[PDB]
Amino acid sequence: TQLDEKQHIVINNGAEPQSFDPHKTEGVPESNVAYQLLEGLVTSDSEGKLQPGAAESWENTPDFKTWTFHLRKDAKWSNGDPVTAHDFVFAWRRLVDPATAAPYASYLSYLQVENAQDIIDGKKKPAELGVEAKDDYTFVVHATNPVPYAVSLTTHQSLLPLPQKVVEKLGDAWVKKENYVGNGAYKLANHIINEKIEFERNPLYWNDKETVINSATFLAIENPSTDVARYRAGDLDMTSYGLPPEQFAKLKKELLGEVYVTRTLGTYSYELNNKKAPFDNVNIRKALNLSLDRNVITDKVLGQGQTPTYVFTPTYIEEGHLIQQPAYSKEPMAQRNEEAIKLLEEAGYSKANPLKFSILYNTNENHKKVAIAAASMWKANTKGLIDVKLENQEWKTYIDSRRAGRYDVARAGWHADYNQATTFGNYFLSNSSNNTAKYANPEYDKAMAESYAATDAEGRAKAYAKAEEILGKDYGIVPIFNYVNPRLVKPYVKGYSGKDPQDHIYLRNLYIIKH
């Protein structure tokens, strides 16, 4: 082979993104766009290993509380403005500022940056945040507790810089295609809502000399069977994650070498609205957990290597090893189901007067299949005491419904943002901006709070096991399985491994070969 003269690629991104402003979003389709247009302090290769981004060098004090980043002195934004430490100060302050209403506001609290939580609570002004431009090219981060995993946290979309001069001038409109300015490998060529996003090289990117792909198109195909049919017709080069379960064994044999799949740091759940009747009743949350047979979903509905789970954190994540699956998961279903029926009758439900709710999910045939199966099991397993409807919404609408609390039970799927257990544990803090379940237990908050001071991995791992135990005894959610990330990838696409624990995909890591 050799490199193709044309370096164009078409990738399914799966949904129309909520926004291209990383302070306004919390989803994978959105981050996939942001990572092409913007670059944070540190970035990664195709396997998720760290490499210099906007910062060419960095260091930490021995107590893991002070992090210093040396930015590139000649780096520019795509409009020619210099990239400076002031852009990072600006962006990080904007993320925690309540006026931004950022879904990931809490991420800086997770990093333990001084005053981040007070600012999110409105007790201090965003300028009190513990980050500084010591000079134009030196950005320093001050944490209140040891955060030895800090560098990995800095790769997340929510900590991408923004072009201060542009955003201050244009406000939220900076994001329009005509106005967008970034320091990633690409820039926006075109955007047709619900159809396509087109990328072109950002020639001012500091590492443009190593970018190979010249142009790329993201599609917004919601259903896996549509994705696969487009791929087969040669009209896209990489599917989104997820393949039709009925086709999976065949695809693997027929398109041998094109199907990538591995276990993923992700958990699929039904999130229960803990402040909406009747899911504010732990008894009912418990009955739903008891009566859902996870193995039906992972073995009969899906069958792609998803593994059943009854806890939120994947136990194979770094420092997750002490977390235990709850004892009910070891009971026969017949025992679990009788228990669930008693709970529901104790709560006043009967065949004539069942527990009625809708499963909210984002349009996607695989989510539909899982919801049909869940509805079916809950009804049958409780002998008619639960009656479930399905409510499918387009991605953007689904996201807004979850955040607004306009749901009873919602399909959910959380991917690790960094390879350390707190990317999951921190989600269920009572004051987390990510916690759309409205779960709140001060004991849970305290078990996580006590982990942040811990000096070592075992002490952190014990605290995460306790947090999970409290969340599990509260039945705060309904965990179903841990993800795998099956995707089809054409044989002429190289640089994709699928082995990145954060499952980032950077166009600047790909290339097209010929023959």
Binding site: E26, G27, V28, Q157, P224, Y241, G242, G266, L302, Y483
Partner: peptide
């Protein structure tokens, strides 16, 4: 991050 797919 919220996963859109399955």
């Amino acid at each position: 991050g919220i996963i859109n797919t399955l």
